[PDB]
Amino acid sequence: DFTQMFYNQNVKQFWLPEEIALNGDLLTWKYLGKNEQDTYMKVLAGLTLLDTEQGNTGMPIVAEHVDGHQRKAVLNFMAMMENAVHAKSYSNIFMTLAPTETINEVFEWVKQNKYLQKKAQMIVGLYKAIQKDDEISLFKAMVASVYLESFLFYSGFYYPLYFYGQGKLMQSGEIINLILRDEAIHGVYVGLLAQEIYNKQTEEKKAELREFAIDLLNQLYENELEYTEDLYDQVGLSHDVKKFIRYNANKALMNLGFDPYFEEEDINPIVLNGLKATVEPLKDDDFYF
Amino acid sequence: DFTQMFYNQNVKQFWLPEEIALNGDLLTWKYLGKNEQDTYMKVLAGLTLLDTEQGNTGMPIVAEHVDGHQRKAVLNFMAMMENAVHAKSYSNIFMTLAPTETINEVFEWVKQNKYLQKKAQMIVGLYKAIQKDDEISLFKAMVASVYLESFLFYSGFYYPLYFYGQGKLMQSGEIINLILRDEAIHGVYVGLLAQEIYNKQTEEKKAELREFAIDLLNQLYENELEYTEDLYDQVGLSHDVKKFIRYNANKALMNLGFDPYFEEEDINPIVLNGLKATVEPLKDDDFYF
Amino acid sequence: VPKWIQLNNEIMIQKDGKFQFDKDKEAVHSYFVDYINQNTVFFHNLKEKLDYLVENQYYEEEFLSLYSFEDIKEVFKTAYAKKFRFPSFMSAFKFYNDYALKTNDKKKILERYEDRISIVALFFANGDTEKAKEYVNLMINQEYQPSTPTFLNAGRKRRGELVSCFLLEVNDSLNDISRAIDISMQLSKLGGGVSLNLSKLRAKGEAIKDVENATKGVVGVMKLLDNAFRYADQMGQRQGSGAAYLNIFHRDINDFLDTKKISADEDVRVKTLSIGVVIPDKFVELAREDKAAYVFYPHTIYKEYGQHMDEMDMNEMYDKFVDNPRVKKEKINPRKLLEKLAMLRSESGYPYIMFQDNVNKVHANNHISKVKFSNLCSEVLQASQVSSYTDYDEEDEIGLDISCNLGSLNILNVMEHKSIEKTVKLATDSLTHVSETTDIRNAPAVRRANKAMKSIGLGAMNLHGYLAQNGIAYESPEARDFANTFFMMVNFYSIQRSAEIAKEKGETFDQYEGSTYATGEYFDKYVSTDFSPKYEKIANLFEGMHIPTTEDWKKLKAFVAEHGMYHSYRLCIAPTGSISYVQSSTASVMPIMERIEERTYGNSKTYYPMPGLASNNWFFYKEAYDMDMFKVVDMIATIQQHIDQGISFTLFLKDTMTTRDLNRIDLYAHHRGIKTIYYARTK
Amino acid sequence: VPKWIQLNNEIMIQKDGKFQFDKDKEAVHSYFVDYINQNTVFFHNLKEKLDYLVENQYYEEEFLSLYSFEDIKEVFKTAYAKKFRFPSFMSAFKFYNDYALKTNDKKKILERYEDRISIVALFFANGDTEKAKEYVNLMINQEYQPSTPTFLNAGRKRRGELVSCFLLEVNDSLNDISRAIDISMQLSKLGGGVSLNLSKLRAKGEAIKDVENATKGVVGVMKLLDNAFRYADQMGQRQGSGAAYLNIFHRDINDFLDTKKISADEDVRVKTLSIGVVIPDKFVELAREDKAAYVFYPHTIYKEYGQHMDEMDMNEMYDKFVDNPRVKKEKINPRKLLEKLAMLRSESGYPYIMFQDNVNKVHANNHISKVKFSNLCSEVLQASQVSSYTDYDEEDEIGLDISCNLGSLNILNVMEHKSIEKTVKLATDSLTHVSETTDIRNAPAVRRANKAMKSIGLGAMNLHGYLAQNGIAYESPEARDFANTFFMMVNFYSIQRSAEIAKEKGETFDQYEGSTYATGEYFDKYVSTDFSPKYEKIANLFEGMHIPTTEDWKKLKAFVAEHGMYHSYRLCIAPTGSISYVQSSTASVMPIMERIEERTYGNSKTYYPMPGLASNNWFFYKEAYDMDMFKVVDMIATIQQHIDQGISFTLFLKDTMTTRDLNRIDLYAHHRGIKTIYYARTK
């Protein structure tokens, strides 16, 4: 009911890194404090590292196990955006703002970081556990994918959106907004594929899959809180970032056809400024009573 | 030495079938004989099948086994083109020119056609035989992919080109030329990757790999002859198409770094005839003259 | 979270296996002792309050100037003497969030429920203190509820229009199309829902002055109207809502329907304009016989016959259209079109279905015009004459564009007070006043029709609430017997009040002499058939009230023949969406969707139990989706036999049932005399 | 492939390293020997032809009835005595595919070139056989070409209006917006391009009846207008074309511009609505000094001052607006806005640029109104007064909506015949006749301004063709000298003809007494500066023709003072899209885009070399993209100093140049006195 519509929306959102000139960001970058520059670098590396997993494994593995030519095509398109567009865009932002040696060091740090690694490996673990012709393991991986696309990225997206909403780092913020817009539709699409599997299950199996999804969300959420304090306490933003994580967790759940887990909260206004029934033929004698 | 330039070439060649309006072919299509329309539909259906498998299976699987994020980005982009752009374009052509029943019938015809099933069996079999960290199985699949890109498509491409060259079906022909332009660079790129693996081998191993490549080519060739006769005898063109596929077989071998295998022949001259802005800020001196 | 929110959420926390319904009451107390009383603005006396509301442009001073301040004080004291208490938290919440008057910055509450009721009553009475007290007693007892426009906007300076729905006839011309777009924007600016009949517009591929295949059809006008309603969206507060109605014999009927398909392209898809389909009995007959039908090009028919396709009876002219070579037509499968209608209603709830022959076989004003379309809620069914909007500097021929004022009787409160007659007459007087004080300066046909037809809509709410609180199953024959008797009483007293108003004013509605009211035909079934309850329980329910017999109906028929009727149309049962919350009533005569509804407001969630829901009447409050739609159709037909206009009949479907079940329900509704079908809501 | 198409495609086949241009001539012969004569309907005599065309509703009876048949036959004989031959295949193809009258079945040709010219001449003369013969000699010599509407529709019963450029003022009200939508639909129905000024409309987030954040801004109005123009598309023949103009100090200017971005959403982007931006000198001064600018909310300015923001001089009002606390404004960077304009023009060629002060410092009718916006082609620059369209049954205040009358001189044919004066005067008379015979009954302000202003647009074309065939580079100072002299003579004879018509009819245009023509200011630069050619080559080009001197201009000034001027506006240089083909001329005063243009008609390819292109003048036919845009700006300013209205000035850019180069060209155009910039076509 939905793949051709998503095909259309995906291909009409096509873009390339070269379209946004990045050099003019240096005019606001130079005015940020060391803690602001440090947080930005670390957040950016976090997003880059997670998105690489999605391009190399997450999207291609789902495309491999999903049946249907049109779905495979949409999924291929999404994998292309991760590897050919998003990855080059993150690299471009880095090369503009930091010298080569600084980039290498930030990636070394974020690569060793406990909270980034915990979430990266949790997601990758579920992708590696998909078994041929087993729709339960595929569903679990789709849940992981939706959580990455619609939830885990957002502790990171917060900061570029925060600057973007203030008139700072506008070129890289525009790029991030385009990336985020792609991840949103990726999350919604994979969510619909997961609901299709979920709806084929018994009531007991459904309850079991719901427990899986909530348990996974809880593990990731508790690590996100730690990740958040680790990066954002030094710039005083953690309270507001936490509200943004919960709001996006609720969107991820709704993508999977589940109820929101967290109470509704208002979001930081600066970040906001940045942001078929069965056809049965009439058999006659249905006109007579 | 080459991936970056292929990356740039692939992304700059990006297109969608919807860019080309097809209603202009309606009259030249209406005017073709029933035999001509039948061959044309079947030819494009055979192409659709090849691109379906190249997009779903061939390109993603090669991407999985090739090392390097940039090489993977090129291969992922090529995969997307196969199933999200190329395979879909044929449906755009079908939906314009043909009624639904004729479309349904031709897709049923691909499923039961023995030559098309044999060529898919052979090519996809080699893709699925790739073993992780086994460069020889990978080479064999890359040879198969080059043969699909640079040889097997051409029994199909002949007919749209033959019409384009006579000023007939020129909108459909424009789509086909764009597809052909893509496959030419895809065949070169995969050819270069295959040569990398071949060049690592002992002379004895190389001799075996040439045997594999030539045996495979001959087996595919013999099947393609029967396919060509089956499609083109009713339009009187089988001998001409055979010359064309031999011509392109030599190009496939060359893409693999091998000498031409078939003698040169005169190809139908009709078929040969068938072949944001940069932003600067405003200076204060630009306001005075 | 607020204390009242916690108390309201405590309902679902079961104690001894039972819902804590009484907790809801506690919530209201909290909602008043912690929010409403603190956020209300109190004055030293009523004089200071009225002066502050008048000078600060909250109230119109004209309607208050007709009373001395002593009379206004007496009216307010009468309102407050009842000591009205909201029995549920959601009733008070809905009133104080949607209908209570607030300050300019919306930080404080200026109007209580009694204040709003007093202001509405003073506006209704038009200078009569005793009539104002009668209206106050009628509304504070919650026997009668003025519509959301009237209740919210009466006596307010910053008010919109008191009329809820407007129906426009669009003639087949560019001038008429542009005028229809302008009038739609003007009426959406006034806050009313606008319905447009597009059946006169010629289909796609018709000739505009001898150049053929030139018209865009009704889909282009649909896109224009959709953009107009998007632009005029009540100053960005409520999304602009429009309805387009097309006859099923229009050639564009498929494209029309294709506007609501979920796979429709952006150049065809229309998203803010509801769609309705008008189905004559000829289409149902063709589908029943499986004979291939023909959709027609309206302009060819107009050229050949001089009249529009929807201006004449298809049941007698369809064969002439088909056999006429000068009429252009396309072959369709009527059963396939019915299946497409069912599929569209399953997917999106559209189109509205209007059974034209069911409307016009009992329509009392067929002489003026046949009913060719309905309103945005598919319950207004009145005669309309298309307007001829000519070129600039040329006089326009102004027709009749339907517009009626809504007001609902609370069946539970009306029958508890044993005051069907008094409530009906007072509601008729209030609706007559609302019609009289309505003057729209940018819709000429609407203004002329309001002045001439004098049509009003008197609805009813809390049918299911009354039945469930009295131990009567909504699908039971006893419930249908109660509906028959109650709505016959409502019709009798509405006709009596209309005739009394005509006598006291010496004037009837325009062209009343040709109506079935004047000829006495309308009263036929009322002077030969007795509508007294056939069950002892229903008769006991109606005890203390004089149920009109055939003799009373004969006397009323003679009275109407002598004096006439002031209103062309009197009764129409609107959905009554949000004002049913304030009255603690179930929505309209429809069965309840759910026993307890969970609604999210802000970041909090609230649970509203159905009014009077408890352990003893839990199963009498049967959910609509669990009900047999055939028995709901029977109930709606029983009510409809006493309602001159239509009833907003929403179909409540389960996901398991197919489009064939929806088609069967539609065909049974057509067989039973259902005039219109509103929505196909799937659980 | 037809024989003429092969002969045309043989041009590109090079013989002896040269293009076979002469082969094109042969193609024409084939196109007439094989196709045109075979499919041309022939009659025994002209009487039978005229009777058949009148009876079959091809022609109008009124204009033919003004002459005896002998006079009509004499006019046709005068047309056919020239023995006119199309010099290129594309000229005849364009005429017989676009302008020649065809049967209702579109398979036979009823009108030849001489027949169409004779009919247009008879329509122009309005009963004067000698005047009709003069018009026939003017058009068969191809000295003057009526615009596509006039040339195609003159004398035809099945026709649109003869005017296709319409400028509408939209007042800040829902009634005015709906009326603007209606008028746009009616004028697109007539076949005209409609331009609407949206600067008076209040921005997004403004108050409607003192409720805040209610207005949708000009973008919602643009969506409505885009839907209206999509709906009204000349009975499904051409895509409905409309333009919207917004002042750059309007707050919506970004959102306005955002309607043309590719990344814009479906609810933001308008596809069939062209956009133009009006840039006062204040914005250019703010950008030049890099001071941050302010975009103002129009309704706050209107409330504070009682006048619209675009109705007062922003140069003297900007500081008062900024310092006024009751005027709401938003901070912007004018240089960023200029870069956004350049980027948008690079992407899509939008918006059109109107330099308000460049237009209004030479505007002769500033007393009536200042020129606030331009047309769809950005060359009509006239005073306009907004209309107050009130509610129904209320009298509207009808203002002035611009609608000028197009017609182009063929500079090559005019100058080789040494007939600047006669051609200009006859073209002025024909334009006056067409303006007087235009009566639009659905656009009140357009009709009122046509009756009052009597404004016509007399353009010129084949400037680059004439210069290249005379060995003059378009960017050379000699070309600018020729343009200066030629257009000064055109202005002189246009003013003389306007004054002569005013003297003959005894009437001037409304409010002429306040114009600079009446005060003599307009003639200042003409009574002090001599515009005779400064180069001997240009003087020899003008040999045989009297060049008006300063004494002649003084005499003309005295004549205008004594007798007045009939036309408020006389000269405007339109793009002249397809009529340039029929006249075998280069389009407008623009330089040629390509020396030989390749076109695809049906499934066939065709080749049109520029008129007079050969090996000797191949270098002088320089392509526009290869030219320096500063020198093109200089030439256009040289012409503009003699044109009262604007010139359709398209920028021709290479893909290499950036937005800085585009902004530099725009700023040099502003510095040089360019009134409008039409398009930014990137090669």
Ligand SMILES: Nc1ncnc2c1ncn2[C@@H]1O[C@H](COP(=O)(O)OP(=O)(O)OP(=O)(O)O)[C@@H](O)[C@H]1O
């Ligand atoms: N359910 C309710 N509906 C409407 N108003 C209410 C409701 N509950 C409380 N109020 C308002 O809040 C006030 C709080 O008083 P409450 O109902 O607790 O009793 P009280 O102080 O004994 O007086 P009384 O009941 O006589 O007004 C009420 O007087 C009334 O104005």
Ligand SMILES: Nc1ncnc2c1ncn2[C@@H]1O[C@H](COP(=O)(O)OP(=O)(O)OP(=O)(O)O)[C@@H](O)[C@H]1O
């Ligand atoms: N280049 C052309 N432009 C316009 N009409 C042409 C052209 N060439 C031919 N025709 C048309 O075809 C006719 C035949 O012209 P042709 O060149 O054969 O000789 P002719 O002496 O002009 O002929 P005729 O006896 O028709 O005047 C012309 O009279 C004219 O109607």
Ligand SMILES: Cc1cn([C@H]2C[C@H](O)[C@@H](COP(=O)(O)OP(=O)(O)OP(=O)(O)O)O2)c(=O)[nH]c1=O
């Ligand atoms: C002008 C126009 C009309 N129409 C359709 C919609 C109207 O319902 C229908 C009638 O237009 P009219 O305004 O009645 O056009 P007309 O009066 O000049 O032509 P006729 O004499 O035949 O009535 O034409 C379009 O679809 N597109 C258009 O652009």
Ligand SMILES: [Mg+2]
């Ligand atoms: Mg008409």
Ligand SMILES: [Mg+2]
């Ligand atoms: Mg106003």
Ligand SMILES: [Mn+2]
């Ligand atoms: Mn990504």
Ligand SMILES: [Mn+2]
């Ligand atoms: Mn993604």
Ligand SMILES: [Mn+2]
């Ligand atoms: Mn391919």
Ligand SMILES: [Mn+2]
């Ligand atoms: Mn390929």
